[PDB]
Amino acid sequence: GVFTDIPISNIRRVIAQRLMQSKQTIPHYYLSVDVNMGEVLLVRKELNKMLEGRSKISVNDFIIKASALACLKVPEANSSWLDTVIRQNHVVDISVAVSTPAGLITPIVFNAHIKGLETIANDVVSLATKAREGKLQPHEFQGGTFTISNLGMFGIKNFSAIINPPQACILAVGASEDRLFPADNEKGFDVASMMSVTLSCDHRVVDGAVGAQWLAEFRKYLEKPITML
Amino acid sequence: GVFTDIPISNIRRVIAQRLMQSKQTIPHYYLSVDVNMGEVLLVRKELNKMLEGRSKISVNDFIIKASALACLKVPEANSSWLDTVIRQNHVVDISVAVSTPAGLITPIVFNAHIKGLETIANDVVSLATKAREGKLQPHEFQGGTFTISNLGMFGIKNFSAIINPPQACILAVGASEDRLFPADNEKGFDVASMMSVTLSCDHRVVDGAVGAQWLAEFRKYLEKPITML
Amino acid sequence: AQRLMQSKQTIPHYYLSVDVNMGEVLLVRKELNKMLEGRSKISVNDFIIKASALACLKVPEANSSWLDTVIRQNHVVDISVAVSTPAGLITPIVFNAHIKGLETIANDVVSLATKAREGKLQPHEFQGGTFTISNLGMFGIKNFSAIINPPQACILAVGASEDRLFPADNEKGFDVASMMSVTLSCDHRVVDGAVGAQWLAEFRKYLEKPITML
């Protein structure tokens, strides 16, 4: 025929009310900056060489570590509005979003401000075995104080997601491309890799100047990785 | 005096309630990509040569054809949320938006997945005679399953429109500019034309990975037009 | 043997001919098969089915049928491709060839070879159609002239792609090019001389520049 009618399952029945609660109440406003990823690609080149056989370190692992350290400098991006109490947290719990064919479910990486890179890289892979094959506990994917969502593996340059209702921030990462800049070369130009980031704050707990300094710290760690020490 | 008071007519009285219904209920989220338009400009150069006198083919005609073919590969961007039934359509009905001095009215191009380019180009022009001179039937501009809105004729690089309430997607096209890329030239760089596109999905029926593949197909047709066959 | 004798006695056949430059089709299917790796393969007998279905829309009198009181004019192109089994000559039907793309037709021609050669056809799958393409270029035949199906008004007949040479504006004076010889066979009761000569003027024009198919 012309149109085909499909009933609604119980997974999307629950998700569709979390989305409508989030957009009606929370006054979103967006921010943007682009990050030079030229020095991360030379660090993970030789960290994977010294760490042969055991594990592998990806570019989505430096982003989880740099986000947990930047929330300690500016702690207002780690809060929650509870209509009477701005609950300020001291523990960073990054909820990485991953995409299954069944939907969009977010495993949680607890205590991301004390763990090293190799401990996180074996947590992201080991929770892909849990989430994609349906072995999650209800306390393993519900919670957290922050959220990173990545769509750079599909070619998207920018997007702007929807904040989890108790949380105040979310991140949104584009795809790493190849641009060129004016330099002090004899030619006049160099080539460099770039990456476009889009924060999405809650305006009730995060002002304009506060969230603009979160992206000033997040840019500074990923441009020189030695500063993470 | 200081301020001048104007009453509200019955055209903007109806539009202002469609807008407020759309933003309150639908949880929008945005996406973006840029498209190389270097090979479309060499096809419409010599299609207008072989089609002398009769009609003229514009760059806003390849976009209507590439959008109707991309909805067949990824059919979830062609649905509708009806609070109990996700009505999935099999017929693509693109509603092109045009701007009159009286307002913003959207003529409908029916069955855009079977028509050729010359049939669409004589439908867009012939509906400009209908819409701008006020000869539309109520079933000629109300309906459709998709929407393309173009503002590249004013210099806007990016924008993000508002979805029609029954529909799930909308498109938003910037203006074709002239950038330059690093190449394998002896110099090191080439010059190319680009164009910036901004999708705006409904998050209740379209996930993140689904809408990111719609822009992966839409980019692929307009970069090599022979793939449309 | 009774369908053949009915066809030649009643229908007053007359033949037509033209040759088509296939130089630009071979550069399109070279890079369509590159972008379509693994899934399917696009042959030169697939552009001919698509160009024939589009040319019947420009000149609709080559798509009719004589019924002795009514010239039934059709609006739906149903090309009946003829294929050769060891059991005989049977014609699977490709329905609605004027809206389908090239990859949809190429997976219909192969999938009906599984049906027809292995004997799994329904009687409504090979009986009908409004047009007929018959190809013998895989045996070296340059020209032939087939027999029209009795309700239908046209048939096509394709030769083998050879290599000729033409006078050009070269410094040498000549270039080399690939050619292909086509032979239409009309029914003179519904198709005149000037009408069928414009069908081959459109069929030649699509296959010489494939971008015109859009």
Numbering used by the authors:
A (entry chain P), B (entry chain i): 1 to 229
C (entry chain H): 16 to 229
Question: Can you provide the manuscript's text about this entry?
Answer:
Pyruvate dehydrogenase complex (PDHc) is a large multienzyme assembly (Mr = 4–10 million Daltons) consisting of three essential components: pyruvate dehydrogenase (E1p), dihydrolipoyl transacetylase (E2p), and dihydrolipoyl dehydrogenase (E3). These three enzymes perform distinct functions sequentially to catalyze the oxidative decarboxylation of pyruvate with formation of nicotinamide adenine dinucleotide (NADH) and acetyl-coenzyme A. By irreversibly converting the main product of glycolysis to precursors of tricarboxylic acid cycle, PDHc controls the carbon flux in carbohydrate catabolism and act as a gatekeeper to maintain glucose homeostasis. Mammalian E2p and E3BP jointly assemble into a 60-mer icosahedral core scaffold with their C-terminal inner core (IC) domains. Exterior to the core, E1p and E3 are noncovalently anchored to the peripheral subunit binding domains (PSBD) of E2p and E3BP, respectively, forming a flexible outer shell around inner scaffold.
To investigate the overall architecture of native mammal PDHc, we have extracted endogenous PDH complexes from porcine (Sus scrofa) myocardium based on a conventional method of mitochondrial multienzyme isolation. We then collected 11,575 cryo-EM micrographs of purified PDHc and processed the dataset with single-particle analysis (SPA). Averaging images from 2D classification revealed that while the internal densities maintained a regularly ordered configuration, the external densities appeared irregular and diffuse, indicating that peripheral subunits exhibited significantly mobility and were non-identical among complexes. We thereby masked the external densities and conventionally enforced ortho-icosahedral symmetry to determine the IC structure at a resolution of 3.66 Å. Similar to those of Homo sapiens and Bos taurus, the porcine PDHc core presented a tightly stacked dodecahedral scaffold, consisting of 60 repeating IC domains, in which C-terminal region of E2p (residues 418–646) was appropriately fitted, whereas the N-terminal regions, including LD domains, PSBD domain, and their inter-domain linkers, were excluded due to their conformational flexibility. Within this reconstruction, adjacent IC domains are compactly trimerized to form a dodecahedron vertex, which visually resembled a tripetalous, pyramid-like structure with a height of 70 Å and a diameter of 80 Å, reminiscent of homologous structures in the cubic cores of A. vinelandii E2p. Comparable intra-interactions were detected in porcine E2p vertex, wherein each trimer, with a total buried area of 4,272 Å2, incorporated multiple inter-domain interactions at four different regions to maintain structural stability. These twenty vertexes were organized into scaffold assemblies through hydrophobic interactions, with a classical double-handed manner.
